[PDB]
Design an enzyme around this catalytic site. Structure first.
Site, mmCIF file in Angstrom:
data_model
loop_
_atom_site.group_PDB
_atom_site.id
_atom_site.type_symbol
_atom_site.label_atom_id
_atom_site.label_comp_id
_atom_site.label_asym_id
_atom_site.label_seq_id
_atom_site.Cartn_x
_atom_site.Cartn_y
_atom_site.Cartn_z
ATOM 1 N N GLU A 266 -1.281 -3.502 5.608
ATOM 2 C CA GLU A 266 -2.311 -2.474 5.493
ATOM 3 C C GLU A 266 -2.941 -2.628 4.114
ATOM 4 O O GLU A 266 -2.228 -2.743 3.117
ATOM 5 C CB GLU A 266 -1.693 -1.075 5.612
ATOM 6 C CG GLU A 266 -2.672 0.056 5.239
ATOM 7 C CD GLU A 266 -2.089 1.473 5.363
ATOM 8 O OE1 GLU A 266 -0.920 1.628 5.809
ATOM 9 O OE2 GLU A 266 -2.794 2.440 4.982
ATOM 10 N N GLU B 160 -9.970 5.143 -0.760
ATOM 11 C CA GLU B 160 -9.027 6.181 -0.332
ATOM 12 C C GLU B 160 -8.752 7.156 -1.454
ATOM 13 O O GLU B 160 -8.571 6.748 -2.611
ATOM 14 C CB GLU B 160 -7.675 5.559 0.102
ATOM 15 C CG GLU B 160 -6.780 6.572 0.865
ATOM 16 C CD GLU B 160 -5.391 6.056 1.234
ATOM 17 O OE1 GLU B 160 -4.919 5.067 0.615
ATOM 18 O OE2 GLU B 160 -4.752 6.684 2.116
HETATM 19 O O1 LIG Z 1 -0.039 6.762 -5.399
HETATM 20 C C1 LIG Z 1 -1.007 7.735 -5.018
HETATM 21 C C2 LIG Z 1 -0.283 8.787 -4.179
HETATM 22 O O2 LIG Z 1 0.258 8.172 -2.989
HETATM 23 C C3 LIG Z 1 0.842 9.131 -2.082
HETATM 24 O O3 LIG Z 1 1.331 8.570 -0.970
HETATM 25 C C4 LIG Z 1 0.278 8.148 -0.106
HETATM 26 C C5 LIG Z 1 0.855 7.773 1.256
HETATM 27 O O4 LIG Z 1 1.482 8.939 1.819
HETATM 28 C C6 LIG Z 1 2.085 8.693 3.106
HETATM 29 O O5 LIG Z 1 2.915 9.709 3.459
HETATM 30 C C7 LIG Z 1 4.115 9.907 2.693
HETATM 31 C C8 LIG Z 1 5.315 9.980 3.648
HETATM 32 O O6 LIG Z 1 5.462 8.722 4.332
HETATM 33 C C9 LIG Z 1 6.592 10.328 2.865
HETATM 34 O O7 LIG Z 1 7.611 10.477 3.740
HETATM 35 C C10 LIG Z 1 8.617 9.461 3.871
HETATM 36 C C11 LIG Z 1 8.809 9.282 5.374
HETATM 37 O O8 LIG Z 1 7.634 8.715 5.968
HETATM 38 C C12 LIG Z 1 10.029 8.426 5.669
HETATM 39 O O9 LIG Z 1 10.226 8.504 7.090
HETATM 40 O O10 LIG Z 1 11.177 8.958 4.984
HETATM 41 C C13 LIG Z 1 11.096 9.018 3.560
HETATM 42 C C14 LIG Z 1 12.419 9.549 3.009
HETATM 43 O O11 LIG Z 1 13.430 8.528 3.138
HETATM 44 C C15 LIG Z 1 9.908 9.910 3.181
HETATM 45 O O12 LIG Z 1 9.707 9.884 1.763
HETATM 46 O O13 LIG Z 1 6.366 11.551 2.147
HETATM 47 C C16 LIG Z 1 5.371 11.438 1.133
HETATM 48 C C17 LIG Z 1 5.335 12.761 0.381
HETATM 49 O O14 LIG Z 1 6.598 12.967 -0.279
HETATM 50 C C18 LIG Z 1 4.023 11.154 1.798
HETATM 51 O O15 LIG Z 1 2.991 11.008 0.792
HETATM 52 C C19 LIG Z 1 0.981 8.395 4.116
HETATM 53 O O16 LIG Z 1 1.554 8.146 5.402
HETATM 54 C C20 LIG Z 1 0.230 7.138 3.657
HETATM 55 O O17 LIG Z 1 -0.877 6.855 4.549
HETATM 56 C C21 LIG Z 1 -0.247 7.288 2.206
HETATM 57 O O18 LIG Z 1 -0.709 6.000 1.806
HETATM 58 C C22 LIG Z 1 1.958 9.904 -2.773
HETATM 59 O O19 LIG Z 1 2.453 10.919 -1.891
HETATM 60 C C23 LIG Z 1 1.463 10.564 -4.059
HETATM 61 O O20 LIG Z 1 2.569 11.175 -4.729
HETATM 62 C C24 LIG Z 1 0.794 9.532 -4.967
HETATM 63 O O21 LIG Z 1 0.181 10.210 -6.085
HETATM 64 O O1 LIG Z 2 9.213 9.794 13.179
HETATM 65 C C1 LIG Z 2 9.679 9.046 12.054
HETATM 66 C C2 LIG Z 2 8.881 9.389 10.793
HETATM 67 O O2 LIG Z 2 7.461 9.369 11.031
HETATM 68 C C3 LIG Z 2 6.649 9.462 9.838
HETATM 69 O O3 LIG Z 2 5.380 9.049 9.715
HETATM 70 C C4 LIG Z 2 4.891 7.697 9.692
HETATM 71 C C5 LIG Z 2 3.384 7.699 9.422
HETATM 72 O O4 LIG Z 2 3.074 8.101 8.078
HETATM 73 C C6 LIG Z 2 2.850 6.289 9.642
HETATM 74 O O5 LIG Z 2 1.566 6.357 9.343
HETATM 75 C C7 LIG Z 2 0.890 5.132 9.109
HETATM 76 C C8 LIG Z 2 -0.119 5.421 7.988
HETATM 77 O O6 LIG Z 2 0.502 5.845 6.759
HETATM 78 C C9 LIG Z 2 -0.957 4.186 7.734
HETATM 79 O O7 LIG Z 2 -1.955 4.515 6.757
HETATM 80 O O8 LIG Z 2 -1.582 3.850 8.980
HETATM 81 C C10 LIG Z 2 -0.688 3.446 10.029
HETATM 82 C C11 LIG Z 2 -1.473 2.893 11.213
HETATM 83 O O9 LIG Z 2 -2.250 3.943 11.824
HETATM 84 C C12 LIG Z 2 0.200 4.624 10.397
HETATM 85 O O10 LIG Z 2 1.132 4.165 11.400
HETATM 86 O O11 LIG Z 2 3.111 5.872 10.983
HETATM 87 C C13 LIG Z 2 4.513 5.608 11.085
HETATM 88 C C14 LIG Z 2 4.821 4.792 12.341
HETATM 89 O O12 LIG Z 2 4.413 5.545 13.490
HETATM 90 C C15 LIG Z 2 5.234 6.961 11.003
HETATM 91 O O13 LIG Z 2 6.656 6.771 11.102
HETATM 92 C C16 LIG Z 2 7.038 10.619 8.909
HETATM 93 O O14 LIG Z 2 6.394 10.426 7.630
HETATM 94 C C17 LIG Z 2 8.571 10.739 8.795
HETATM 95 O O15 LIG Z 2 8.940 11.898 8.062
HETATM 96 C C18 LIG Z 2 9.210 10.756 10.184
HETATM 97 O O16 LIG Z 2 10.620 11.026 10.137
#
Ligand SMILES: OC[C@H]1O[C@@H](OC[C@H]2O[C@@H](O[C@@H]3[C@@H](O)[C@H](O[C@@H]4[C@@H](O)[C@H](O)O[C@H](CO)[C@H]4O)O[C@H](CO)[C@H]3O)[C@H](O)[C@@H](O)[C@@H]2O)[C@H](O)[C@@H](O)[C@@H]1O
Ligand SMILES: OC[C@H]1O[C@@H](O[C@@H]2[C@@H](O)[C@H](O[C@@H]3[C@@H](O)[C@H](O)O[C@H](CO)[C@H]3O)O[C@H](CO)[C@H]2O)[C@H](O)[C@@H](O)[C@@H]1O
Ligand SMILES: *[C@@H]1O[C@H](CO)[C@@H](O[C@@H]2O[C@H](CO)[C@@H](O[C@@H]3O[C@H](CO[C@H]4O[C@H](CO[C@H]5O[C@H](CO)[C@@H](O)[C@H](O)[C@@H]5O[C@H]5O[C@H](CO)[C@@H](O)[C@H](O)[C@@H]5O)[C@@H](O)[C@H](O[C@H]5O[C@H](CO)[C@@H](O)[C@H](O)[C@@H]5O)[C@@H]4O)[C@@H](O)[C@H](O)[C@@H]3O)[C@H](O)[C@H]2NC(C)=O)[C@H](O)[C@H]1NC(C)=O
Length: 298
Positions: free
Chosen positions: A115, A120
Protein backbone atom coordinates in the site's frame (compact mmCIF):
# COMPACT_ATOMS: atom_id res chain seq x y z
CA UNK A 1 13.83 6.93 -15.80
CA UNK A 2 11.92 7.58 -19.07
CA UNK A 3 8.24 6.62 -19.20
CA UNK A 4 5.39 7.03 -21.66
CA UNK A 5 1.73 7.80 -21.25
CA UNK A 6 -0.44 4.76 -20.39
CA UNK A 7 -3.66 6.42 -19.13
CA UNK A 8 -4.90 9.97 -19.19
CA UNK A 9 -8.05 10.45 -17.14
CA UNK A 10 -9.99 13.73 -17.29
CA UNK A 11 -13.62 14.49 -16.40
CA UNK A 12 -16.10 11.89 -17.63
CA UNK A 13 -13.27 9.43 -18.47
CA UNK A 14 -13.23 8.45 -14.77
CA UNK A 15 -16.75 7.06 -15.10
CA UNK A 16 -15.58 4.33 -17.49
CA UNK A 17 -12.06 3.70 -16.20
CA UNK A 18 -12.80 3.58 -12.42
CA UNK A 19 -15.53 1.96 -10.39
CA UNK A 20 -17.15 3.20 -7.16
CA UNK A 21 -16.61 0.78 -4.30
CA UNK A 22 -19.84 0.38 -2.40
CA UNK A 23 -18.24 -1.35 0.56
CA UNK A 24 -18.25 -1.22 4.33
CA UNK A 25 -15.36 1.05 5.24
CA UNK A 26 -12.29 -1.08 6.04
CA UNK A 27 -11.20 1.77 8.38
CA UNK A 28 -14.55 1.79 10.30
CA UNK A 29 -15.43 5.42 9.49
CA UNK A 30 -18.75 7.25 9.81
CA UNK A 31 -19.31 6.83 6.08
CA UNK A 32 -21.68 5.25 3.59
CA UNK A 33 -19.70 4.56 0.44
CA UNK A 34 -22.24 4.66 -2.39
CA UNK A 35 -22.11 2.99 -5.75
CA UNK A 36 -21.53 4.78 -9.02
CA UNK A 37 -25.20 5.21 -9.97
CA UNK A 38 -26.05 6.50 -6.48
CA UNK A 39 -23.08 8.88 -6.46
CA UNK A 40 -24.02 10.36 -9.84
CA UNK A 41 -27.73 10.69 -8.94
CA UNK A 42 -26.90 12.42 -5.64
CA UNK A 43 -24.18 14.56 -7.24
CA UNK A 44 -21.54 13.14 -4.93
CA UNK A 45 -19.56 12.46 -8.09
CA UNK A 46 -19.62 15.01 -10.91
CA UNK A 47 -17.52 14.40 -14.01
CA UNK A 48 -17.63 16.85 -16.89
CA UNK A 49 -15.34 19.03 -19.02
CA UNK A 50 -11.94 19.13 -17.35
CA UNK A 51 -13.20 18.45 -13.84
CA UNK A 52 -13.88 15.49 -11.56
CA UNK A 53 -15.59 16.31 -8.25
CA UNK A 54 -15.76 13.64 -5.49
CA UNK A 55 -17.54 14.90 -2.41
CA UNK A 56 -19.41 14.12 0.78
CA UNK A 57 -23.12 14.66 1.34
CA UNK A 58 -23.42 18.20 2.82
CA UNK A 59 -27.21 18.41 3.20
CA UNK A 60 -28.42 15.38 5.21
CA UNK A 61 -28.58 15.26 9.00
CA UNK A 62 -27.85 11.65 9.75
CA UNK A 63 -30.02 9.21 11.61
CA UNK A 64 -27.62 8.04 14.37
CA UNK A 65 -28.63 4.34 13.97
CA UNK A 66 -28.47 4.51 10.18
CA UNK A 67 -25.41 4.41 7.93
CA UNK A 68 -22.73 7.10 7.87
CA UNK A 69 -22.35 10.23 5.77
CA UNK A 70 -22.67 9.45 2.03
CA UNK A 71 -19.32 9.66 0.27
CA UNK A 72 -17.31 7.94 -2.45
CA UNK A 73 -14.29 5.67 -2.91
CA UNK A 74 -13.25 5.20 -6.54
CA UNK A 75 -10.83 2.55 -7.74
CA UNK A 76 -9.05 2.26 -11.11
CA UNK A 77 -10.09 -0.79 -13.12
CA UNK A 78 -6.47 -1.24 -14.28
CA UNK A 79 -3.60 -2.25 -12.02
CA UNK A 80 0.01 -1.14 -12.08
CA UNK A 81 3.46 -2.27 -11.01
CA UNK A 82 6.42 -0.18 -12.23
CA UNK A 83 4.85 3.15 -13.25
CA UNK A 84 4.47 6.84 -12.52
CA UNK A 85 1.09 8.24 -11.41
CA UNK A 86 0.52 12.01 -11.53
CA UNK A 87 -2.45 13.74 -9.84
CA UNK A 88 -3.31 17.33 -10.79
CA UNK A 89 -5.48 18.33 -7.85
CA UNK A 90 -7.26 21.69 -7.48
CA UNK A 91 -8.93 20.99 -4.09
CA UNK A 92 -8.98 18.17 -1.48
CA UNK A 93 -11.61 17.53 1.19
CA UNK A 94 -11.50 19.70 4.28
CA UNK A 95 -13.40 19.83 7.53
CA UNK A 96 -13.39 18.37 11.00
CA UNK A 97 -13.66 14.56 10.82
CA UNK A 98 -12.44 14.29 7.23
CA UNK A 99 -9.99 11.61 6.18
CA UNK A 100 -9.30 11.93 2.45
CA UNK A 101 -6.74 9.79 0.58
CA UNK A 102 -5.23 9.25 -2.87
CA UNK A 103 -3.27 6.01 -2.78
CA UNK A 104 -2.53 2.60 -4.32
CA UNK A 105 -2.97 -0.91 -2.98
CA UNK A 106 -4.01 -4.47 -3.76
CA UNK A 107 -7.13 -4.87 -1.56
CA UNK A 108 -7.42 -8.56 -2.43
CA UNK A 109 -4.26 -9.61 -0.62
CA UNK A 110 -3.70 -6.68 1.75
CA UNK A 111 -1.14 -6.02 3.20
CA UNK A 112 0.89 -8.50 1.19
CA UNK A 113 0.54 -6.66 -2.14
CA UNK A 114 1.61 -3.39 -0.52
CA UNK A 115 0.00 0.00 0.00
CA UNK A 116 1.36 3.46 -0.87
CA UNK A 117 -0.51 6.45 0.56
CA UNK A 118 0.31 9.42 -1.66
CA UNK A 119 -2.09 12.10 -0.34
CA UNK A 120 -3.46 11.49 3.16
CA UNK A 121 -4.31 13.15 6.46
CA UNK A 122 -7.07 13.78 8.95
CA UNK A 123 -9.00 16.62 10.54
CA UNK A 124 -7.35 19.35 8.43
CA UNK A 125 -3.95 18.66 10.02
CA UNK A 126 -1.18 19.62 7.62
CA UNK A 127 1.30 18.56 6.39
CA UNK A 128 0.61 15.72 3.99
CA UNK A 129 1.82 12.21 4.95
CA UNK A 130 3.19 9.76 2.39
CA UNK A 131 3.35 6.23 3.81
CA UNK A 132 3.90 2.61 2.91
CA UNK A 133 2.09 -0.23 4.62
CA UNK A 134 3.43 -3.74 3.89
CA UNK A 135 3.90 -7.26 5.22
CA UNK A 136 6.90 -8.24 7.38
CA UNK A 137 10.57 -7.43 6.78
CA UNK A 138 10.28 -3.98 5.22
CA UNK A 139 11.86 -0.98 6.90
CA UNK A 140 13.41 2.32 5.79
CA UNK A 141 16.86 3.77 6.55
CA UNK A 142 17.03 6.64 9.00
CA UNK A 143 18.74 8.90 6.45
CA UNK A 144 17.89 9.09 2.76
CA UNK A 145 17.63 11.78 0.16
CA UNK A 146 14.26 13.53 0.19
CA UNK A 147 12.90 16.94 1.17
CA UNK A 148 10.39 15.53 3.72
CA UNK A 149 10.77 14.26 7.28
CA UNK A 150 10.56 10.57 8.15
CA UNK A 151 8.48 9.73 11.14
CA UNK A 152 8.14 5.98 11.49
CA UNK A 153 10.55 3.70 9.61
CA UNK A 154 8.92 0.30 9.92
CA UNK A 155 6.43 -0.38 7.08
CA UNK A 156 5.12 -3.70 8.46
CA UNK A 157 1.41 -3.29 9.34
CA UNK A 158 1.72 -5.71 12.24
CA UNK A 159 4.13 -3.29 13.99
CA UNK A 160 3.45 0.04 15.77
CA UNK A 161 -0.37 -0.12 15.41
CA UNK A 162 -0.04 -0.01 11.62
CA UNK A 163 1.40 3.48 11.42
CA UNK A 164 3.35 2.22 8.35
CA UNK A 165 6.61 3.90 7.38
CA UNK A 166 5.74 7.54 6.77
CA UNK A 167 7.22 10.81 5.61
CA UNK A 168 5.78 14.28 6.32
CA UNK A 169 5.87 16.86 3.53
CA UNK A 170 7.95 19.96 4.44
CA UNK A 171 5.32 22.62 3.64
CA UNK A 172 1.87 23.39 5.09
CA UNK A 173 0.43 23.84 1.61
CA UNK A 174 0.90 20.14 0.90
CA UNK A 175 -2.39 19.44 2.67
CA UNK A 176 -5.76 20.59 3.91
CA UNK A 177 -7.15 24.14 4.07
CA UNK A 178 -3.59 25.44 3.33
CA UNK A 179 -3.46 23.37 0.12
CA UNK A 180 -6.99 24.46 -0.86
CA UNK A 181 -6.33 28.18 -0.27
CA UNK A 182 -3.33 27.86 -2.59
CA UNK A 183 -5.29 26.17 -5.42
CA UNK A 184 -3.88 22.70 -4.80
CA UNK A 185 -0.95 21.33 -6.71
CA UNK A 186 0.55 18.22 -8.19
CA UNK A 187 1.41 14.91 -6.62
CA UNK A 188 3.56 12.43 -8.58
CA UNK A 189 4.55 8.94 -7.48
CA UNK A 190 7.20 6.82 -9.23
CA UNK A 191 7.36 3.12 -8.33
CA UNK A 192 10.10 0.81 -9.52
CA UNK A 193 11.49 -2.47 -8.33
CA UNK A 194 14.06 -0.44 -6.37
CA UNK A 195 12.09 2.37 -4.73
CA UNK A 196 8.93 4.43 -4.38
CA UNK A 197 9.22 8.22 -4.60
CA UNK A 198 6.59 10.93 -4.19
CA UNK A 199 6.93 14.54 -5.27
CA UNK A 200 4.60 17.37 -4.22
CA UNK A 201 4.61 20.70 -6.06
CA UNK A 202 2.22 23.46 -4.97
CA UNK A 203 0.00 25.10 -7.57
CA UNK A 204 2.06 28.30 -7.52
CA UNK A 205 5.46 26.55 -7.55
CA UNK A 206 8.03 28.28 -9.72
CA UNK A 207 9.96 25.01 -9.97
CA UNK A 208 7.34 22.39 -10.92
CA UNK A 209 8.85 20.13 -13.63
CA UNK A 210 7.08 20.63 -16.98
CA UNK A 211 6.62 16.86 -17.19
CA UNK A 212 4.43 16.98 -14.08
CA UNK A 213 2.57 20.25 -14.74
CA UNK A 214 1.76 19.87 -18.48
CA UNK A 215 1.34 16.10 -18.84
CA UNK A 216 3.17 15.38 -22.10
CA UNK A 217 3.11 11.80 -23.32
CA UNK A 218 6.85 11.27 -22.56
CA UNK A 219 8.42 12.02 -19.14
CA UNK A 220 11.81 11.60 -17.50
CA UNK A 221 11.95 11.51 -13.70
CA UNK A 222 15.70 12.19 -13.73
CA UNK A 223 14.73 15.82 -14.41
CA UNK A 224 12.42 16.16 -11.41
CA UNK A 225 14.81 17.05 -8.59
CA UNK A 226 14.76 15.52 -5.14
CA UNK A 227 11.54 13.69 -4.12
CA UNK A 228 9.42 14.85 -1.22
CA UNK A 229 9.31 11.26 0.09
CA UNK A 230 11.78 8.48 -0.78
CA UNK A 231 11.34 4.81 0.08
CA UNK A 232 14.55 3.08 -1.03
CA UNK A 233 15.17 -0.66 -0.94
CA UNK A 234 18.09 -0.47 1.58
CA UNK A 235 16.06 -2.37 4.20
CA UNK A 236 13.07 -3.53 2.13
CA UNK A 237 12.75 -5.52 -1.05
CA UNK A 238 10.27 -3.08 -2.60
CA UNK A 239 9.44 -5.33 -5.57
CA UNK A 240 8.63 -8.31 -3.32
CA UNK A 241 6.37 -6.25 -0.99
CA UNK A 242 4.28 -4.70 -3.77
CA UNK A 243 2.31 -6.40 -6.49
CA UNK A 244 -0.19 -5.05 -9.08
CA UNK A 245 -2.04 -2.21 -7.37
CA UNK A 246 -5.12 -0.17 -8.23
CA UNK A 247 -5.27 3.59 -7.72
CA UNK A 248 -7.88 4.59 -5.13
CA UNK A 249 -9.25 8.07 -4.28
CA UNK A 250 -11.66 8.34 -1.39
CA UNK A 251 -13.07 10.35 1.47
CA UNK A 252 -14.01 8.74 4.76
CA UNK A 253 -14.86 10.31 8.15
CA UNK A 254 -13.74 9.51 11.69
CA UNK A 255 -12.75 5.80 11.93
CA UNK A 256 -9.37 4.17 12.78
CA UNK A 257 -7.29 7.36 12.42
CA UNK A 258 -9.47 10.50 12.18
CA UNK A 259 -11.98 9.39 14.85
CA UNK A 260 -9.50 8.88 17.72
CA UNK A 261 -10.64 11.41 20.31
CA UNK A 262 -7.08 12.58 21.04
CA UNK A 263 -6.50 13.36 17.36
CA UNK A 264 -9.96 14.80 16.65
CA UNK A 265 -10.12 17.05 19.70
CA UNK A 266 -6.33 17.69 19.38
CA UNK A 267 -7.15 19.23 16.01
CA UNK A 268 -9.55 21.67 17.68
CA UNK A 269 -12.67 19.80 16.59
CA UNK A 270 -15.61 19.78 19.10
CA UNK A 271 -17.20 16.81 20.82
CA UNK A 272 -17.09 13.36 19.23
CA UNK A 273 -16.24 12.81 15.60
CA UNK A 274 -19.39 10.78 14.95
CA UNK A 275 -21.74 13.32 16.55
CA UNK A 276 -20.06 16.11 14.60
CA UNK A 277 -20.32 14.24 11.30
CA UNK A 278 -23.99 13.32 11.92
CA UNK A 279 -25.20 16.75 12.82
CA UNK A 280 -23.23 19.29 10.82
CA UNK A 281 -23.99 18.63 7.13
CA UNK A 282 -23.23 22.24 6.11
CA UNK A 283 -19.69 21.89 7.58
CA UNK A 284 -18.94 19.46 4.73
CA UNK A 285 -19.72 21.76 1.78
CA UNK A 286 -15.94 22.00 1.25
CA UNK A 287 -15.34 18.27 1.77
CA UNK A 288 -14.62 17.70 -1.91
CA UNK A 289 -11.88 16.60 -4.27
CA UNK A 290 -11.63 18.71 -7.43
CA UNK A 291 -9.29 16.84 -9.76
CA UNK A 292 -8.11 18.24 -13.11
CA UNK A 293 -6.48 14.99 -14.27
CA UNK A 294 -4.84 11.73 -13.23
CA UNK A 295 -2.16 10.37 -15.57
CA UNK A 296 -0.32 7.08 -15.47
CA UNK A 297 2.95 6.38 -17.33
CA UNK A 298 4.71 3.04 -17.90
O1 LIG B 1 1.87 8.55 11.51
C1 LIG B 1 0.71 9.36 11.33
C2 LIG B 1 -0.41 8.73 12.17
O2 LIG B 1 -0.69 7.40 11.69
C3 LIG B 1 -1.82 6.80 12.35
O3 LIG B 1 -2.09 5.56 11.90
C4 LIG B 1 -2.66 5.61 10.60
C5 LIG B 1 -3.22 4.23 10.23
O4 LIG B 1 -4.24 3.89 11.18
C6 LIG B 1 -4.82 2.59 10.94
O5 LIG B 1 -5.55 2.18 12.01
C7 LIG B 1 -4.86 1.89 13.24
C8 LIG B 1 -5.27 0.49 13.73
O6 LIG B 1 -4.86 -0.50 12.78
C9 LIG B 1 -4.65 0.21 15.11
O7 LIG B 1 -5.11 -0.98 15.56
C10 LIG B 1 -4.27 -2.14 15.55
C11 LIG B 1 -5.14 -3.26 14.99
O8 LIG B 1 -5.46 -3.02 13.62
C12 LIG B 1 -4.47 -4.61 15.16
O9 LIG B 1 -5.46 -5.59 14.81
O10 LIG B 1 -4.07 -4.79 16.53
C13 LIG B 1 -3.14 -3.84 17.06
C14 LIG B 1 -2.79 -4.22 18.50
O11 LIG B 1 -1.94 -5.39 18.48
C15 LIG B 1 -3.77 -2.44 16.96
O12 LIG B 1 -2.82 -1.45 17.35
O13 LIG B 1 -5.04 1.27 16.01
C16 LIG B 1 -4.50 2.54 15.65
C17 LIG B 1 -4.88 3.52 16.75
O14 LIG B 1 -4.25 3.12 17.98
C18 LIG B 1 -5.10 2.97 14.31
O15 LIG B 1 -4.56 4.25 13.90
C19 LIG B 1 -5.59 2.63 9.63
O16 LIG B 1 -6.17 1.35 9.37
C20 LIG B 1 -4.61 2.96 8.50
O17 LIG B 1 -5.30 3.08 7.24
C21 LIG B 1 -3.82 4.24 8.82
O18 LIG B 1 -2.78 4.32 7.85
C22 LIG B 1 -1.59 6.73 13.85
O19 LIG B 1 -2.77 6.23 14.50
C23 LIG B 1 -1.27 8.11 14.42
O20 LIG B 1 -0.94 7.98 15.81
C24 LIG B 1 -0.10 8.75 13.66
O21 LIG B 1 0.07 10.11 14.10
O1 LIG C 1 -10.81 -8.12 12.63
C1 LIG C 1 -9.40 -8.04 12.90
C2 LIG C 1 -8.96 -6.58 13.06
O2 LIG C 1 -9.46 -5.75 12.00
C3 LIG C 1 -8.89 -4.42 11.96
O3 LIG C 1 -8.84 -3.61 10.89
C4 LIG C 1 -8.03 -3.77 9.71
C5 LIG C 1 -8.21 -2.55 8.80
O4 LIG C 1 -7.63 -1.36 9.35
C6 LIG C 1 -7.54 -2.84 7.46
O5 LIG C 1 -7.70 -1.74 6.75
C7 LIG C 1 -6.87 -1.59 5.61
C8 LIG C 1 -6.54 -0.09 5.54
O6 LIG C 1 -5.82 0.39 6.69
C9 LIG C 1 -5.73 0.18 4.28
O7 LIG C 1 -5.52 1.60 4.19
O8 LIG C 1 -6.52 -0.27 3.18
C10 LIG C 1 -6.76 -1.69 3.13
C11 LIG C 1 -7.40 -2.07 1.80
O9 LIG C 1 -8.72 -1.51 1.71
C12 LIG C 1 -7.59 -2.09 4.33
O10 LIG C 1 -7.75 -3.52 4.29
O11 LIG C 1 -8.13 -4.00 6.86
C13 LIG C 1 -7.67 -5.14 7.60
C14 LIG C 1 -7.92 -6.43 6.82
O12 LIG C 1 -9.33 -6.57 6.59
C15 LIG C 1 -8.36 -5.08 8.98
O13 LIG C 1 -7.95 -6.21 9.78
C16 LIG C 1 -8.93 -3.69 13.31
O14 LIG C 1 -8.07 -2.53 13.24
C17 LIG C 1 -8.56 -4.64 14.46
O15 LIG C 1 -8.74 -4.01 15.72
C18 LIG C 1 -9.38 -5.93 14.38
O16 LIG C 1 -9.18 -6.78 15.52
C1 LIG D 1 -23.48 19.00 -9.17
O1 LIG D 1 -22.29 19.47 -8.57
C2 LIG D 1 -21.54 20.24 -9.50
C3 LIG D 1 -20.09 20.46 -9.07
O2 LIG D 1 -20.09 21.04 -7.79
C4 LIG D 1 -22.26 21.57 -9.70
O3 LIG D 1 -21.55 22.26 -10.72
C5 LIG D 1 -21.38 23.66 -10.43
O4 LIG D 1 -22.53 24.36 -10.86
C6 LIG D 1 -22.52 25.70 -10.39
C7 LIG D 1 -23.90 26.32 -10.65
O5 LIG D 1 -24.32 26.00 -11.97
C8 LIG D 1 -21.39 26.49 -11.05
O6 LIG D 1 -21.28 27.71 -10.34
C9 LIG D 1 -21.04 28.88 -11.16
O7 LIG D 1 -19.74 28.90 -11.78
C10 LIG D 1 -19.44 30.07 -12.54
C11 LIG D 1 -18.08 29.92 -13.23
O8 LIG D 1 -18.08 28.71 -14.00
C12 LIG D 1 -16.89 28.60 -14.81
O9 LIG D 1 -15.69 28.94 -14.13
C13 LIG D 1 -15.34 28.10 -13.04
C14 LIG D 1 -14.03 28.65 -12.51
O10 LIG D 1 -13.13 28.45 -13.59
C15 LIG D 1 -11.81 28.95 -13.36
O11 LIG D 1 -11.02 28.24 -12.42
C16 LIG D 1 -10.73 26.88 -12.74
C17 LIG D 1 -9.84 26.29 -11.63
O12 LIG D 1 -10.65 26.19 -10.48
C18 LIG D 1 -10.07 26.75 -14.12
O13 LIG D 1 -9.96 25.40 -14.51
C19 LIG D 1 -10.88 27.51 -15.17
O14 LIG D 1 -10.18 27.48 -16.40
C20 LIG D 1 -11.10 28.96 -14.71
O15 LIG D 1 -9.85 29.59 -14.56
C21 LIG D 1 -9.96 31.03 -14.72
O16 LIG D 1 -10.09 31.73 -13.49
C22 LIG D 1 -8.98 31.57 -12.59
C23 LIG D 1 -9.28 32.34 -11.30
O17 LIG D 1 -10.40 31.75 -10.68
C24 LIG D 1 -7.67 32.02 -13.24
O18 LIG D 1 -6.56 31.75 -12.40
C25 LIG D 1 -7.48 31.31 -14.58
O19 LIG D 1 -6.31 31.76 -15.23
C26 LIG D 1 -8.72 31.53 -15.46
O20 LIG D 1 -8.86 32.91 -15.75
C27 LIG D 1 -15.18 26.66 -13.52
O21 LIG D 1 -14.94 25.80 -12.42
C28 LIG D 1 -16.36 26.16 -14.35
O22 LIG D 1 -15.92 24.98 -14.99
C29 LIG D 1 -16.96 23.99 -15.08
O23 LIG D 1 -17.74 24.08 -16.27
C30 LIG D 1 -17.01 23.93 -17.48
C31 LIG D 1 -17.94 24.12 -18.67
O24 LIG D 1 -18.24 25.50 -18.77
C32 LIG D 1 -16.27 22.57 -17.52
O25 LIG D 1 -15.39 22.48 -18.63
C33 LIG D 1 -15.44 22.38 -16.25
O26 LIG D 1 -14.91 21.08 -16.24
C34 LIG D 1 -16.29 22.62 -15.01
O27 LIG D 1 -17.28 21.63 -14.97
C35 LIG D 1 -16.80 27.19 -15.40
O28 LIG D 1 -15.90 27.18 -16.49
C36 LIG D 1 -19.44 31.29 -11.61
O29 LIG D 1 -19.16 32.47 -12.37
C37 LIG D 1 -20.81 31.41 -10.94
O30 LIG D 1 -20.78 32.48 -9.98
C38 LIG D 1 -21.22 30.11 -10.26
O31 LIG D 1 -20.46 29.94 -9.05
C39 LIG D 1 -20.05 25.73 -10.98
O32 LIG D 1 -19.12 26.24 -11.92
C40 LIG D 1 -20.19 24.22 -11.21
N1 LIG D 1 -18.93 23.56 -10.88
C41 LIG D 1 -18.32 22.70 -11.71
C42 LIG D 1 -19.01 22.39 -12.98
O33 LIG D 1 -17.22 22.17 -11.44
C43 LIG D 1 -23.68 21.32 -10.19
O34 LIG D 1 -24.40 22.53 -10.04
C44 LIG D 1 -24.43 20.17 -9.50
N2 LIG D 1 -25.47 19.70 -10.40
C45 LIG D 1 -26.75 19.55 -10.07
C46 LIG D 1 -27.59 18.73 -11.02
O35 LIG D 1 -27.25 20.04 -9.05
Amino acid sequence: ATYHLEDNWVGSAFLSTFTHEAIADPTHGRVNYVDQATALAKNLTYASGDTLILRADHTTTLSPSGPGRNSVRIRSIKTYTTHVAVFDVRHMPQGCGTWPAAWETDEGDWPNGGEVDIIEGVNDQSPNAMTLHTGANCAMPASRTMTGHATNNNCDVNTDGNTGCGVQAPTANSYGPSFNANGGGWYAMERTNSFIKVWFFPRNAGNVPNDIASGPATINTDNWGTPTAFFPNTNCDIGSHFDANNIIINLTFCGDWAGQASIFNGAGCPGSCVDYVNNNPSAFANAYWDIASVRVYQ
